[PDB]
Write a protein that binds this ligand. Structure first.
Ligand SMILES: [Cl-]
Lengths: 239, 241
């Protein structure tokens, strides 16, 4: 074979450029391309949220609500040095479909706690920039003594695995990055974590792709960079 | 640039194995993922076809007709040695949206000529097996002396471009075949033509991705045998940084 000759050429260049790998799988598994619908919240779901007052236009004949901005009637105390667990606990038991979200980031400058919707317990990685690219998140807003005041929410529902495929390994993903010239010399691969990204929208439906999220620290000073590499092996089709 | 190292390794390996190729674009191009709806054939549309009686159930409250199956009152003579042009003429003049379809294969074993629907000049490459894979085709059925007796039709409409992306180069696509151990020693790369394939369904919507349709030929008392490959044209290895 030639995949082999090429692969270990990339090995013998990575060793040349002193690139470090960490506990990475070399055994392929099976994966799926997923399509999910954008949840549309109804009148009856919204008012069914006890002890919570809305901060958005209710739905109607013209208007659909795919984004909840809700205010708690009384703000909820979160522990100082246990903040992360208390935050999960709050999301699970008070927010609709809360079980389905995992904690991403505690941003202290923005005074918020960000949660990503998962699939099979794996992050659906998204941009924490803005509400545009918030397909599936819960963002908790805090004030003062770290009490949650309001939260923003969007949800994916009705998942369909539409296409099965073989997935590239972890090491595969890293070689693929080095190939694309995304690794300077002496650069370390800190982690290689699995999850999804919305590859593109359809009418009212996102199409998810499984990915490896790679975290490299390297020099330019020392910085971490994050790459989202496509886990799907869809190169050759059938004829 | 470390892809430049590896690409030129692959380039040499190919010369080592005597794989010849010519006039292949090394420059990146921009393409689109697209969608289309499966044409649903109304009653009006069906009994607007003159000198044609249907061989399928008419549409109803319960039913919808995405696939025609249509018989000519009097079968139409095709020509002996000019068969292909006579076929294209028939499809365009006598069939709904005929000019959108480009002739694909003449299959004497099944006694049927096959047209594939196109988009912006290119083929929607499909399988020629069952009618399940027949998302956009016209199939002429013949009997006796080259005379068209009937045809089956499926049509795509309402094409939308839903995401523009960078395509991989012609040259890239052939290297990809080699890399994955698909090309035999001493083979010739005859063509790298562009087109689309159905990636998967979604109710009435079909999602279509661009592909390179690479034809290769080699020897096998020598025989010149050909192989056809379809490589996904979309470059989508790195999605975010
Ligand atoms: Cl893809």
């Amino acid at each position: 074979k030639e995949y082999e000759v090429i692969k270990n050429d990339v090995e013998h260049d990575m060793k040349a450029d002193h690139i470090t790998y960490e506990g990475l799988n070399k055994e392929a598994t099976e994966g799926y391309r997923i399509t999910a619908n954008q949840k549309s919240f109804s009148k009856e779901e919204i008012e069914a949220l006890k002890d919570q007052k809305p901060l958005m236009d209710m739905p109607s004949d013209d208007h659909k609500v795919t984004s909840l901005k809700m205010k708690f009637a009384n703000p909820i105390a979160l522990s100082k040095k246990d903040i992360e667990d208390d935050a999960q606990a709050l999301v699970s038991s008070k927010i609709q479909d809360g079980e389905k979200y995992k904690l991403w980031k505690v941003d202290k400058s923005k005074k918020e706690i960000i949660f990503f919707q998962t699939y099979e317990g794996h992050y659906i990685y998204q941009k924490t920039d803005n509400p545009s690219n918030m397909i599936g998140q819960v963002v908790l807003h805090l004030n003062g003594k770290n009490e949650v005041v309001s939260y923003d929410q969007t949800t994916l529902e009705t998942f369909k695995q539409i296409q099965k495929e073989s997935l590239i390994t972890e090491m595969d993903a890293v070689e693929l990055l080095y190939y694309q010239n995304q690794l300077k010399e002496y650069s370390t691969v800190k982690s290689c974590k699995f999850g999804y990204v919305a590859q593109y929208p359809l009418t009212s439906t996102q199409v998810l792709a499984p990915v490896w999220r790679i975290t490299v620290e390297y020099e330019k000073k020392t910085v971490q960079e994050y790459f989202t590499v496509n886990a799907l092996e869809s190169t050759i089709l059938d004829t």
